[PDB]
Every structure is written in C-alpha cells, then in structure tokens.
Design a protein around this ligand. Structure first.
Ligand SMILES: NC(=O)C1=CN([C@@H]2O[C@H](COP(=O)(O)OP(=O)(O)OC[C@H]3O[C@@H](n4cnc5c(N)ncnc54)[C@H](O)[C@@H]3O)[C@@H](O)[C@H]2O)C=CC1
Ligand SMILES: NC(=O)C1=CN([C@@H]2O[C@H](COP(=O)(O)OP(=O)(O)OC[C@H]3O[C@@H](n4cnc5c(N)ncnc54)[C@H](O)[C@@H]3O)[C@@H](O)[C@H]2O)C=CC1
Ligand SMILES: NC(=O)C1=CN([C@@H]2O[C@H](COP(=O)(O)OP(=O)(O)OC[C@H]3O[C@@H](n4cnc5c(N)ncnc54)[C@H](O)[C@@H]3O)[C@@H](O)[C@H]2O)C=CC1
Ligand SMILES: NC(=O)C1=CN([C@@H]2O[C@H](COP(=O)(O)OP(=O)(O)OC[C@H]3O[C@@H](n4cnc5c(N)ncnc54)[C@H](O)[C@@H]3O)[C@@H](O)[C@H]2O)C=CC1
Ligand SMILES: O=C(O)C1(C(=O)O)CC1
Ligand SMILES: O=C(O)C1(C(=O)O)CC1
Ligand SMILES: O=C(O)C1(C(=O)O)CC1
Ligand SMILES: O=C(O)C1(C(=O)O)CC1
Ligand SMILES: [Mg+2]
Ligand SMILES: [Mg+2]
Ligand SMILES: [Mg+2]
Ligand SMILES: [Mg+2]
Ligand SMILES: [Mg+2]
Ligand SMILES: [Mg+2]
Ligand SMILES: [Mg+2]
Ligand SMILES: [Mg+2]
Ligand SMILES: [Mg+2]
Ligand SMILES: [Mg+2]
Ligand SMILES: [Mg+2]
Ligand SMILES: [Mg+2]
Lengths: 330, 331, 330, 329
C-alpha cells in the first residue's frame, strides 16, 4: 500500500557521487550528509562548482564521481541529460561491475530515451515540492511525500537503495513514500502541464477579453478580482490543509450553487480533452513533439512568448504593476 | 515484359565488390562464386566478419573495396546507408570513373535521400524471399522471381549489368524478372507493412478482446483457434501453389458463404483506407515520418513495444507457451 | 481449467459406433483402435465405403450401427446433419435407455437446430487442426488442444465420456483440453470466417487493384510481393512457436514503426466490424442466413464464385501460375 | 459487330422435341415446321395439350420428347422450371451423350439454379416481343431481333445450333441477332421490371395524388390527361419508329424546354437508384428474394395487389371505365 520507513542498511560503505547542484541539487545535499553519509558532488566547472564546495563537499568533475561511487543522483534537467549520458557516463557505465542509477522525473526514461546496462540498478526518487519550501520543513524534521519505483534491476535488493534514499533525503519518516513505476510519474507531471493548468489561464484570458471587448468592463477594474489579488493563491492554503471540497464553506451559499452545478455541467466537456492528451502521452508523442523543436531552435517557443507577453492582458497588467509600486519587467 | 534469362557477358573482367554480408549476404555471395565470377567483399569487423571470414572471401574494408570494383551490391540496411554513403562512398564516387550501384530495396533512393553522380549507373535487384529458404530452392534449381529497373544512367549499356547480376544471384533461370522502376517496388514493400498486415493483427487483437470482455470466452480457449494452431500458417502453402481462391474448397460450404459475402461487404471499408496510406507514401510522408523519430531516439517505437508485449493478449499467450512446452522469452 | 489427462474407465465394455469417415474420420478412427477399444464404423455407401473398411473397421449401416453402441461420433458435415438426424437417428434415439452423442463443431446444436432426448449424454469434442497433419503430431506422441463442454445431461458423468473420448482421439495427453460450452465454440469457428480472414483478402484485393488502376504498377509485378510467394509461410510459422509479436524481430525496424503505429490507428475501425458480426451470430441470424440460401439452391454462392474467379486478379494470377510451371486448373 | 444469317446445316437428320406450348409456344412452333424441320412437342396434359395436336404436332408426354430429340426448347415459365428439371429431365439427361438445351430467358440459369452435365450444349434464344405481334412480323417476312450466347459447351459447335434455331424461329433473316452471354440477358429483363417501369407508375400515382389532395383538381379531370388516354402508348410508337429524341419534335417548343432541362436535373437522382438495384441483381439477391417468397405462399404479392387495386386511383378510375362503356374489373 504505502511505506512509512525502512532500515538504513546498505549505503554505509558505498559512496554517493551526486551530479548537479541546481534546486534539488541543494536540498538532497544537505540531508544525506546530515543523516550519516560520506559524499562527493558532481557538476561541470562553472559557477556552481565553486559554491557547493563551500558546503565542504569535495567536488570534482562529473566523470570523477561515477568512477568512484556506486551511486549517482542525477539531479539535473530532464532535457540535456541525454547529451551528458552519451558523452561521459555511457563510456563510464560499461566499465563498471555494479551501479545504482537514480533520477528525479522520468520524461527521458519512460519515453525510452535511456537504456542503461543490465549491470545497473535502476530506480526513481521524486520529490513533490517546488524546491524552496522543502527547506522550511527539513529544519522542522518533517517528512514529505515521494514517489518511487523501478524500471530495471539485477540485484534482488534494488528497492532498499531507494528506500535508503527515501530516508537519505529525509522525505520520510514523517510523511510517506509510494510504490509505483516510472510511467505513472511522468504521466502526471505532464498532465498538469497540459490539461488543468492551461485551461485555468485561457478562462482568465477569455473572461477578461470577453468583459472588455463585448460587455464593456474597463481593464483596470476586472483584473483586481480575477487574479491580480492573492485570493487565487491564498485559496490554495485552504485546499492543501482544509481540503478541496470543504473549502467552499468559506464562500457563502450563493457561490456554491453557481459553482457546483457548473462543475458537473462542464465536466464531460473536459474529460473529453483529458482523454486525448493522456493518450497523446501514453504513446510518447509529446516526447517526439518536444524532441524535434529542440532540433529546430525553439521557433514556436519564441513566438508564443512573443505573443502572450505582447498580448492585450499583460499590456494593461504591466501598467497595474507599474501602479501598485512593484517591479516592472524590462 | 517478364524475362526469363539473358546473356552473361559484361562482368567477365570486372571485379564484383560486395558491401554487407547480412541475411542477403549469404544469399547472393556464394552464387556469384558458384556461377563463375571473382569477388571481393565489404563489411565492418564484428561477429559478422567471423562467418564472413570462413568462406574464402578476400576481405578488405569498404573504401578499399570500391577503389577496385566497377560494380557494388550494397546489401546493407535501408536505414544506415545515409550514414555510410556520405562518409565513405561519396568521396570515393567522385574519385571513380564509372560505377554501377545495385540495391535490394529503394526506400532511400525513391524518396530522394541519395543523389549519386552522373558518372554512375543505377539499378535495382530485389528478391522477394525472406532470405533463408533460397538454398532449399536454389540447389533444387527451381529459382525465384525478382524486380528490376533504373533510376539514372549515363552509359546506354545499363540493363545487361542488372540482367547479368540477375544471373549473378541465381534467382534466374527457372524463375522470372519483372521490369519496373524504383518507385513501384518501395511502394509495395511498405504497403504490406501498412494496410493488410496490421489489420490482420488488430482483428485478432479485437476478436479475442471482444470475446473475453463482452461475450465471456475463457482466454486459454480462444487463442487455440485464432492463430496459435496450425490453421493459419499451414494454409499459406495452399495460397502459394493451389491459388488464393481455390484454397476455399478445402473449407466446406458453410465457411465459404460467410467469408465471400463479407469480403465484399467490407471491401469499400478498406479500399477507403488504402487510398490514404499509399498517398501517404507516394508523397514521401512516411520517410519524413520515419526520418525524424530516428533523430529523436525511438520514443514511440519503445512505447508500443512496451504496450503490445505488456498487453493483455501476450500475457495469457505467454502462459500458453509456458504450457505447451515451447520456448518462452526471458522478458 | 486446462485439463491434461483422466482415467479411461467408462468406454470399456461397449462398442464404439462412429458415423462419417471423412477427413476427421481417419483422424480419430486410427487412434481408438490403436489405443485399445472396439469399433464399428458408420458411413453410407460410396467411394468412402471402399477405403474405410479397407482399413479393417467393420461396417454396418447407420440404423444397424447406433443400435449397437451407447456412444456415437457424428463426424459428418455441419450442414446435412439435419437431414440425417430426423430420418434415421431420432426414431433410433427414443429406442434407448442411455446414449452418448458427440459432435465436432456445434453450428447445429448451439443455434438450436437439434434438441435430443432427455436420456442422452450430450458433449462436444472439437479438434483445432485441419486434419491432415495430425499423423505428423500423432506418431511423435505429442498431443494437441481440444475444446469440450456439455449441453444436456441426465447421467452425472457427462464429462468423463468426453474426457474418455478425449484420450480416444490421441489429442491428449501432451497437449491440453479446455472446459467450455457449445456456444463458445461455434462463435469462434465462424468469427474467423467473418472478420479477420475476409478482410485479409479485401486488402490484398484492394492494394493490387489500387496499385494498377491508380498508381500504375504492372500486374505481374505486384503479386510476387503480396501473396504469390510463400512469404506467409515464414511469417506465421514464426507465430506458431516464436510468438505473434516477437516475430517482428525478423523484420527490420523500418517495417515495425510502419506496422505497429497503424495497428493502433485502424484498431477501432475494425472492432466495430467485429461487434456488428458477433452480435449477428450470438442472436443466431447467420444460421438463418445460411439456412434459407440452402433452401433456394445456392444462388448467391454461385454468383460470387462466378465473380471472384472471373475477377481481374485471378485473370492475371492464373497466367502467372501458367508461367511459373505450377499447376493450372485442369 | 453483329450477325445476320448462317448455314442451316445441323438440324437435318434430327427431331426437335419442344417443351411447353404457351404464348411463345406458337411463336417458335409454327416457324420451325414451316421452314423445313421435323418436330414433336411436349406439354403436360391440361387444356393446352390437344390444341397443339389439333395443329398437327405429334405430341407425347414431356419425357417422351427428350428421348426422341437431341434438342429441347424449354418454352415454359422461369419459375416452375426448377420443379420439372429435377423430377423428370435430370433422370433423363444422362440418357443422352450429346443433348442440346435452349431457353428463352435465364433467370434460372444465370443465377445458378441449374447445373446440367458437361456433355450438354447450353444456349440461349431470346425473342424480344410479347408474342402476339410476331405473326405480323412473320407473314411480312420482316425479321426481329434476338439475343444469344453460351454458358457451357462440350461439343465445339455450340453456336451453329443457336444460329440454326436462329433460322428455326424466323427472327432472322431480315432482322438481327446479338452475341452475348446469359448474364447480360436476365440483367436487362429484370432491370426494366425494377427501375424505369415502376417509377413511371409512382409518378402517375403521385402527380394525381398530389393534384387532388393538395392542389384541388378533381379525380375525373386529371386521369384523362395522365394515362386514361391512348396518348402515352401512342407516345411509344414514335419512339419505336421515329426514334426517342426526334419524338419531341412533334410536341411544341414549350414542352421541350420543360422536359429536357428536367431530364438532366433529375438524372443523378435516378442513376443513384439504378446503381443500387443492378448491384442487387449482379450479386444474385433478387433470385433469393423471390425464391423464398415462393416458399412462403405469396404473402406480400397478395397484399400489394390487395392495395393497388383497392387504392384511391383505381377506385375512381373504375368509375371512369364504368362510364366509357368498357369492361369493369
Ligand atoms: N525546484 C524545481 O524546479 C524542481 C526540479 N525537479 C527535477 O530537478 C531536475 C533539475 O532541476 P534543477 O537542477 O533543480 O533546476 P534548474 O532548472 O535551475 O537546473 C539547472 C542545472 O542544470 C545543470 N546542467 C545542465 N546541463 C548541464 C551540463 N552539460 N553540464 C553540467 N551541468 C548541467 C546545471 O549544473 C544546473 O545546476 C529535473 O529533473 C526535475 O525533474 C523536480 C521537482 C521540482
Ligand atoms: N529478410 C530480410 O530482412 C531481407 C533483406 N532485404 C534487404 O537487404 C538489405 C539489408 O538486409 P540484411 O543485411 O540481410 O538484414 P540485417 O538486419 O541482418 O543487416 C545486418 C547486416 O548488415 C551489416 N551492417 C549492419 N549495420 C551496419 C552498420 N552500421 N555499418 C556497417 N554495416 C552494417 C552488417 O554487416 C550485418 O551483417 C535491405 O535493403 C533489406 O530491405 C530484402 C529481402 C529480405
Ligand atoms: N478440415 C476440416 O474439414 C475439419 C472438419 N471438422 C468438422 O468435421 C465434421 C465434418 O468434417 P469432414 O467429414 O471431415 O469434411 P467433408 O466435407 O470432406 O465430409 C466428407 C464426409 O462426409 C460424409 N458425407 C458427406 N455427405 C454425406 C451425406 N449426404 N450423407 C451421409 N454422409 C455424408 C461422407 O461420408 C464423407 O466421408 C464437421 O463437423 C466439421 O466442423 C472440424 C476440424 C477440421
Ligand atoms: N409475353 C411473354 O410472357 C413472353 C414469354 N417469354 C418466356 O417464355 C417462357 C414462358 O412463357 P409462356 O409459356 O409463353 O407464358 P404462360 O404464362 O402463358 O405459360 C403457360 C404455358 O406454360 C405451360 N406450363 C405452365 N405451367 C406449367 C407447369 N406447372 N407444368 C408444366 N407446364 C406448365 C403450359 O403448357 C402453358 O401452356 C418464359 O421463359 C419467358 O421468359 C419471353 C418473351 C415474351
Ligand atoms: O469573492 C467572492 O467569491 C464573493 C462572493 O460571495 O461571491 C464576493 C465575496
Ligand atoms: O468448417 C469450419 O468452419 C472449420 C474451420 O476451421 O474453419 C472446421 C471448423
Ligand atoms: O524490410 C522490408 O520492408 C522487407 C519486407 O519483406 O517486409 C524486406 C523487404
Ligand atoms: O400534350 C401536350 O403536351 C400539349 C402541349 O403542347 O403542351 C397539350 C398539347
Ligand atoms: Mg550546461
Ligand atoms: Mg513535467
Ligand atoms: Mg511536477
Ligand atoms: Mg554497424
Ligand atoms: Mg518494406
Ligand atoms: Mg518486403
Ligand atoms: Mg451424401
Ligand atoms: Mg466455421
Ligand atoms: Mg475452424
Ligand atoms: Mg402446371
Ligand atoms: Mg423479367
Ligand atoms: Mg422482358
């Protein structure tokens, strides 16, 4: 069902050479060392190689690490990890007896872009926070939830390495850790980025556009109600803590009837959408969709940014942020 | 028109360089030696160089090969020729007077991925066997048919090279050799892979799925009728010698009427399909479809294999193969 | 479940009457006399009267036969069995204490065209082979699978007689034997004759027709690729032992992506075509659909044969068989 | 390409044992005797029997006929011919080595309901007339057209027997005879009975029904213009003689433009129809459609007759025929 803790046996004697010192590269670093592990760190000699050395991690080059450690936490992007894996690590992978390879998210594994040896223990360890607030909870010794699983194993005890890191990063005890597979992680992390999020923006991008152009509302008026307030975020504290559906008591009845009746009116209008995009991911199209834009130079990515920023809404909103006293993007 | 045989004049005095020694390697290789020609062979040093070494071919690398021969039999995949042709051969092609390129199939030529010199003759030589069974028919004398044609020539003495290599490969005499172009072969070799083959699988992947989940058949029951028996492959022999439509006498009348009526009921449902996929090939979309997923790292290819093997059908069929005593894969 | 073997008790102390000696006659005939049982055989005097008792099996007429046996293996067509059952056997059926009545396939039972007495042991024993090769499976000792079941019983041991006859036919042991009902047999044997087979022909009858009349291929060219070769041998024999899907390894990658992507494209296009036909069988229409044509002298059957043989394809393919030296229709 | 005549060689030294003496019975019978051929005749004993014998035919029973004749003109219906062919003729068919078998129309052959030996000469001889007027075309000597062909031969000269009978029936010389096969005959004879004829009736059954109920015309008024006059049948003679499209010259211009423009307006509305019915015949359904109705006792056939006769149109038309002084049914 769900795990709460495990023995912390294996990794006392084996070394862990971490790769990357990004956002997650700074949260896992602090914890495993502060829970009983000798560790070195990996990052190419740019600005980041000088900082985490000030954390006492005797940082070397990337390939210096995997040639020492039986583990490597590849806390680096899900996009350029391809480039690394075939210049450096694969010539290093085949030249090894045993190795335990872990990732954060599996946009590259689940969609088949990585096929490591059968001499390697494959696992996943997914934090479920943006990366900043996690440091408010670790100081509190507070666990937090993680997703796990396996793609490939040749050891029998591949899971305890994950359950070890499941206690190595301090995410448990206090929280929980889910058993799963790689497919069921990348599916969700992208489903948020396809179906429920962007529709939130379109409605806010349409209701405003529908108010001014058609129904005559002034631009400065509307945005104070839709999202320029903190209600759309201050609501989220209730959801994470007081629950989704009990949240509606804190708005009066006249908002409930208007909201619940429509939630079921326009339910089948969006389940039809989600059935398409998920099937557009289970097949791996979104990887072949993205992985060619990279091989063209981000044309569309450039344009749509050149529209939404230069759209009608941010125009009038930039005057608001110019008028509430906050910053103004160059 | 359909030819049977020709003179075997030109290649007496020109060395037969050969590239690749794969499945079609051993097909054409020991026939040109057997029917009286000199050969050097091309391949890249790996396990296939071993069995290639055991057969008396005096083998060099590829660049040294074409620097000797006026002909070449590029019996290598239809996918990595692009890699080879621009590293090795093209710097050698422009440094060659006259040369005659032969291929198996033209997925790369017909779709324009290869632009050889004007100083070169171009031909196609396609067998229509899988590759294994030729030495059951070859030593037996009864040959097998081939397809031919031209894309580009600057010689006027072109077709005899193909008709020469046609005897170089032993598929003639006894068999035949069809006159055609590059387009009309690569069109067909994929039309099988798009329209009539996969629909065969879907129906078998639906009728089973429709029997169990809706009509209550046990899974171990059905598969013994659909394809796991000697019903399907055993009748391919009747179609090969006794003819397609005369095959149906060997099933009684109650099976005939149910089949012929539906063959014409659901004909316009599939011609409707085939009109689309062929036009999706005549234009070259399928090459621009394949050419990119290569340049992404086989994402979709990985997934569908990760579905059909992990689907419902193979699961219960893997238990069957675990139960008839035959092999079952380590995966 | 998949039963493998049983005691062979019941069929000792009787005589095994058998009706019909067609293809499946000599299949089962050879084995009951081989595996230690007494037999008389039933067939109505024609050429088959020659070869049947020429192999030793004593013969009386059918009415002279079923009166001797408690069992009977009606290995005759699924079409004219109606004619026999009401002239001869039914006047003989009522004149029995017990009786055991077995068939090969149940196009006549499951669709209600036979309703035997109350004291008959009704069973099914279905081979799943064409009939010829069974001696290539038999003398190697390897069994092969059979389908079974019951419709109407008044004896308590309706299944042991089937399991008894199951060992009387040589298909077990070594192979298997499935428990089922009559409905689940005729459903499949006809579904192959309705959905996946004829579509195989139409595509081959369309792609060729579409190549020549629209895309300019010469007729002698195409057929050498589609089906005029024995390529279908070396693709489905792989399916017989090397598996449906693992056979794709023996075709290169470019033939896979073109095939698997389309198998899922045109899946829902054919599941419709199956659902409409199976429901046309579960209701019993196809038995009525045949049964009236039989009562009109095979008009349509005569015509479609006068089309498919006189079509464009055989008009050209016959000249190829006229040209490879293989047999032409004599 | 078309034939006009042949040598009259084969049928000398034989006897032509005819079966049936119906409407076409007296068509072919009178002529074969009166152009130099010996004949016996076949018909099962009813009122029709002795009238042929009253005209000199040495008649016997049916099965008597075939054993005296290498030929058999089966001038009988296309429906009960099945009943005969398996009770009587099939036990008799193998009595001959060579035997010749001729029909009028092939609703039973082309749709596969007959499969004779491979030692029998199979042919078709189709007159194209009702049967009454042939003895107006005959005495004047002017021939008339026929359709021919073969289904099965085991003799090498299956055609001169047809070209022989082609002079046995007198339809040539003077006329023509077309080369064809069985399929291309039954296709046409039924296509007339499916597409162009019944639509003629429906329009006449609708335009009237549309005039009275909707647009207010009286019933006695309209029918005098639509079909109760002999114009419509007199519109036909000009077609048979002066040709289809030159026929319209005898109607003034205001009727032409109203007719030609609509002939092309509502063309694809009926080609869309005909494509369905012919394919409903080429596959052989209409024989299976009919053949089962015979095996159910003509239920529908009874009803539609019980409707169209008891419809609104014949009701008011029967009063008109009751009013012009002609018959009343
Ligand atoms: N705070 C966040 O945004 C969270 C990130 N993740 C996961 O973290 C992983 C990466 O995210 P972050 O690094 O934390 O944020 P980030 O976007 O700031 O990543 C920057 C990192 O990329 C590294 N890098 C990229 N290419 C490199 C190359 N050729 N050589 C050396 N270093 C290279 C750099 O060292 C740098 O540290 C992803 O897989 C993601 O799934 C998961 C939860 C939230
Ligand atoms: N059953 C089949 O696969 C048949 C093959 N063909 C055609 O023959 C050609 C190739 O067929 P096969 O070689 O027999 O199949 P294959 O998949 O077994 O090819 C492997 C062979 O190609 C060579 N090779 C492979 N990759 C190479 C690379 N990167 N660099 C250098 N050499 C490499 C190797 O020497 C190896 O022996 C294709 O055009 C194919 O369409 C046509 C008839 C049947
Ligand atoms: N390859 C096959 O045909 C197989 C046959 N079966 C089943 O076996 C049964 C019949 O199969 P077969 O006899 O082998 O095929 P078949 O169509 O060749 O039947 C020939 C036999 O039927 C007998 N027969 C035919 N007409 C008869 C009649 N009017 N009166 C009396 N006897 C007549 C004859 O004695 C002859 O021996 C069916 O239930 C069929 O489903 C099942 C597995 C495969
Ligand atoms: N106006 C027409 O109906 C024409 C007739 N035909 C063809 O002539 C053939 C039959 O036409 P007709 O005989 O002239 O019309 P009919 O309907 O008047 O036939 C009645 C004749 O057929 C015989 N007969 C009827 N029922 C019989 C039965 N149960 N058993 C034995 N004999 C029976 C009788 O001797 C009787 O004289 C058909 O094949 C038809 O296609 C073709 C051209 C025109
Ligand atoms: O913010 C809301 O949702 C309000 C409501 O009750 O409708 C205005 C207070
Ligand atoms: O006659 C049939 O329907 C069978 C077939 O295999 O197609 C024997 C069962
Ligand atoms: O690789 C292919 O496409 C071939 C096939 O037969 O399917 C060999 C030609
Ligand atoms: O019969 C016709 O068609 C008439 C016309 O000229 O319109 C009335 C005479
Ligand atoms: Mg970088
Ligand atoms: Mg994501
Ligand atoms: Mg996420
Ligand atoms: Mg290689
Ligand atoms: Mg191909
Ligand atoms: Mg091929
Ligand atoms: Mg019989
Ligand atoms: Mg069947
Ligand atoms: Mg079957
Ligand atoms: Mg009568
Ligand atoms: Mg008619
Ligand atoms: Mg007519």
């Amino acid at each position: 069902k769900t795990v709460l803790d495990a023995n912390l046996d294996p990794l006392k004697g084996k070394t862990i050479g971490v790769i990357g010192y990004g956002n997650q590269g700074r949260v896992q670093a602090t914890i495993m060392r502060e829970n009983g592990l000798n560790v070195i760190v990996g990052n190419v000699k740019d600005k980041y190689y000088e900082l985490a050395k000030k954390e006492g991690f005797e940082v070397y080059e990337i390939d210096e690490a995997v040639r020492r450690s039986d583990v490597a936490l590849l806390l680096i992007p899900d996009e350029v990890m391809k480039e690394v894996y075939e210049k450096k690590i694969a010539p290093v992978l085949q030249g090894k007896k045993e190795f335990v390879l872990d990732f954060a998210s599996g946009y590259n594994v689940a969609f088949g872009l990585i096929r490591p040896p059968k001499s390697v223990d494959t696992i996943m360890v997914a934090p479920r926070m943006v990366g900043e607030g996690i440091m408010d909870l670790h100081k509190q010794g507070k666990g937090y939830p993680v997703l796990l699983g396996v793609k490939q194993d040749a050891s029998g005890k591949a899971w305890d390495y994950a359950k070890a890191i499941a206690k190595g990063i301090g995410a448990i005890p206090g929280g929980i850790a889910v058993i799963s597979s790689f497919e069921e992680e990348a599916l969700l992390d992208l489903m948020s980025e396809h179906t429920w999020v962007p529709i939130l923006f379109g409605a806010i991008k349409a209701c405003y556009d529908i108010a001014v152009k058609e129904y005559g509302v002034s631009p400065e008026a509307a945005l104070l109600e839709f999202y320029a307030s903190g209600e759309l975020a201050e609501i989220a504290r209730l959801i994470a803590e007081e629950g989704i559906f009990n949240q509606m008591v804190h708005h009066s009845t006249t908002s409930q009837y208007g909201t619940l009746t429509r939630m079921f009116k326009y339910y089948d209008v969006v389940r039809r959408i989600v059935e398409n995009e998920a099937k557009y991911i289970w097949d791996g199209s979104f990887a072949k969709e993205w992985s060619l834009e990279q091989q063209a130079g981000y044309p569309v990515f450039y344009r749509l940014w050149e529209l939404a920023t230069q759209s009608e809404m941010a125009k009038a909103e930039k005057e608001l942020y110019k008028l509430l006293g906050r910053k103004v993007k160059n």
